[PDB]
Amino acid sequence: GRENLYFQGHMDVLSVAGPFMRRLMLLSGETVNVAIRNGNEAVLIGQLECKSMVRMCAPLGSRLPLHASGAGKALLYPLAEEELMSIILQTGLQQFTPTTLVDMPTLLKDLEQARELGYTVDKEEHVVGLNCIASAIYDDVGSVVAAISISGPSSRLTEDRFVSQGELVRDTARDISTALGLKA
């Protein structure tokens, strides 16, 4: 079912996300990605690149770590601690950069913060020089079905912009969730 990469629910998120991905790319100036959970990794299924020659440009289908990428963490923060414990038992907490979160308590502390703010921040935890800011997309029952993120060079998506961009990503995710809920 939803464990299939081509699951219709995933495609439904893509079908309504277009307009919002466009607005987010324009307002943030960075590449916008849509990821879903598959095989205990975050897989990029939608993307809209920004126009800058230097940017994030992983291909669709790229598989990202759930505990170390912004997109991955956005798929994790809505989950109950028991499910999180289950996932990590199987994936482990591979270190990708010098600051990756590789301990369960720090990871949980970070996800609790993202749940309070409605967005997560990945500051070079996956790829050196790449910051990712992401937020969960939810279905009619409040379950997380996907995540949207802006990803770009750490020198451009700087710390002084995390709050303004985080709120824009959260609002964007919120609108996608709403659009997904419409019966057209």
Q: What is the CATH number of the domain that holds 138?
A: 3.30.450.40
Strands of the 63-65 sheet, one edge to the other? 63-65, 41-48, 31-38, 144-153, 130-138, 120-123
Q: How far apart are CA 136 and CA 158, in angstroms?
A: 22
Sign, Cα dihedral of 119, 76, 157, 44: negative
In the chain, the number of structural domains is 1
Pair 46, 60: CB distance under 8 Å: yes
Beta strands at 144-153 and 120-123: parallel, antiparallel or unpaired: unpaired
The residues facing 34 across adjacent strands are 46, 148
Q: What are phi and psi of 166, to 5 degrees?
A: -60, -45
Domain limits at 33? 1-184
Q: How far apart are CA 98 and CA 80, in angstroms?
A: 28
| Closest by Cα among 84, 72, 66 to 34 | 72
Tell me, in Å, the resolution of the deposited structure.
1.8
Question: Is 70 annotated as contributing to ligand binding?
Answer: yes
Q: How far is CA 64 from CA 4, 69, 74, 96, 175, in A?
A: 16, 7, 12, 11, 24
Residue carrying the six token digits 């709120």: 167
Question: Is 57 annotated as contributing to ligand binding?
Answer: no
Q: How many CB atoms lie within 10 A of CB 7?
A: 16
Q: How far apart are CA 86 and CA 8, in angstroms?
A: 25
Q: How far apart are CA 82 and CA 59, in angstroms?
A: 32
Q: What's the burial of 156, exposed, middle or buried (CB within 10 Å: 0-12/13-18/19+)?
A: middle
Question: Is 69 annotated as contributing to ligand binding?
Answer: yes
Q: How far apart are CA 53 and CA 59, in angstroms?
A: 16
Pair 127, 98: CB distance under 8 Å: no
Q: String of b and e for 75-107 (b: at least 16 CB within 10 Å)?
A: bbbbbeeeebeebbeeeebeebeeebbeeeeeb
Question: Is 137 annotated as contributing to ligand binding?
Answer: no
Q: String of b and e for 9-45 (b: at least 16 CB within 10 Å)?
A: ebeebeebbeebbebbbebbbbbbbbbbbbeebbbbb
Q: What are phi and psi of 57, to 5 degrees?
A: -155, 50
Q: How far apart are CA 95 and CA 93, in angstroms?
A: 6
Q: What are phi and psi of 115, to 5 degrees?
A: -65, -35
Q: How far apart are CA 152 and CA 126, in angstroms?
A: 12
